[PDB]
């Protein structure tokens, strides 16, 4: 087997090597900003014929921003149907009200944590 595969949500533990012998194991770990959820594997062994066993990075999900309920008399909607970082939250106030603290928040990654690009807005009487 040659240098193990690389992934987007999971990286290799330790420095890679050019060649690998049969029966050798290589381990990965969810990258910064991701986390593990059983039961999928994050390691793989170099079998008889020098091609690693099947392996994915699907056991590693992105960190999510905290929950945000609808701002009284308004509505908060996960623009991208997800709280995961790399996405956004949108706010539309109801008919008789108007929105103040502008009305898009971006769930972004900051270090090892997903956090909203700001604070929820509010709806007022009009």
């Amino acid at each position: 087997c040659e240098e193990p595969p690389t992934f987007e949500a999971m990286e290799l533990i330790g420095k890679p090597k050019p060649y690998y012998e049969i029966g050798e194991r290589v381990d990965y770990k969810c990258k910064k900003g991701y986390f593990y959820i059983p039961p999928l594997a994050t390691h793989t062994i170099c079998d008889r014929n020098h091609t690693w066993l099947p392996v994915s990075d699907d056991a590693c999900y992105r960190e999510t921003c905290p929950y945000i309920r609808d701002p009284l008399n308004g509505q908060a909607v996960p623009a991208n149907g997800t709280y995961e970082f790399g996405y956004q939250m949108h706010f539309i106030c109801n008919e008789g009200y108007y929105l103040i603290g502008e009305e898009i928040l971006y769930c972004e990654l900051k270090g090892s944590v997903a956090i909203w690009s700001g604070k929820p807005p509010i709806c007022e009487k009009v």
Binding site: I68, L72, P120
Partner: protein, 197 residues
């Protein structure tokens, strides 16, 4: 040999404590662990809010609730008088054991060290410190804790008393309508001289 712990057991299915008087039915889930360590008792305590009302206090600028715990002459929780509505017991995995409590007295706050009605030693009946509510935006919100060890008895049955009281009063509430969820305090560990068995 888990008879050195007298605790509520880890995270109980249903709420076991009724902290809010403006309430009825057990509004929260009080976790308490008393461990015999030398001539002292290590008290480990915090609370998991369960009822919507209690959980919504985090949206308030100035709060404080108390958990009153009374025990009788033998070291047994007085359930009708206390906030903790269900007895404590020894360790059995992550749960309360189910049998006779071995030397409960031993876990009670010594009346010798913390007396009743002695105004000249009153000051000696208090324990203070800080726990933290971990807010939505992940910031640490400090909560003040006062602890009174059996100073005032409530009637002819209460032989010992432990009253923990959390509080906070700042410019802003640790939460807001859209972000609120559960009211949880971080473990607060304190110490006290124990009564003799």
């Amino acid at each position: 040999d888990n008879i050195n712990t007298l605790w509520t057991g880890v995270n109980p299915t249903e709420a076991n404590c009724q902290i809010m008087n403006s309430s009825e039915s057990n509004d929260c889930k009080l976790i308490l662990t008393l461990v015999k360590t030398g001539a002292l008792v290590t008290a480990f305590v915090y609370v998991i809010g369960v009822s919507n009302n209690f959980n919504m206090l985090t949206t308030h600028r100035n709060i404080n609730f108390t958990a009153e715990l009374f025990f009788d002459s033998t070291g047994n929780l007085l359930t009708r008088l206390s906030s903790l509505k269900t007895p404590l017991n020894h360790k059995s995995g992550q749960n309360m054991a189910t049998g006779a409590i071995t030397n409960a007295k031993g876990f009670m706050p010594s009346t010798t060290a913390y007396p009743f009605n002695d105004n000249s030693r009153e000051k000696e009946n208090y324990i203070y410190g800080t726990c933290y509510y971990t807010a939505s935006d992940r910031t640490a919100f400090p909560i003040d804790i006062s602890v009174m060890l059996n100073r005032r008895a409530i009637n002819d049955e209460t032989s010992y008393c432990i009253r923990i009281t959390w509080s906070w009063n700042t410019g802003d509430a640790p939460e807001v309508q859209t972000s609120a969820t559960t009211l949880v305090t971080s473990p607060f560990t304190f110490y006290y001289i124990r009564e003799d068995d």
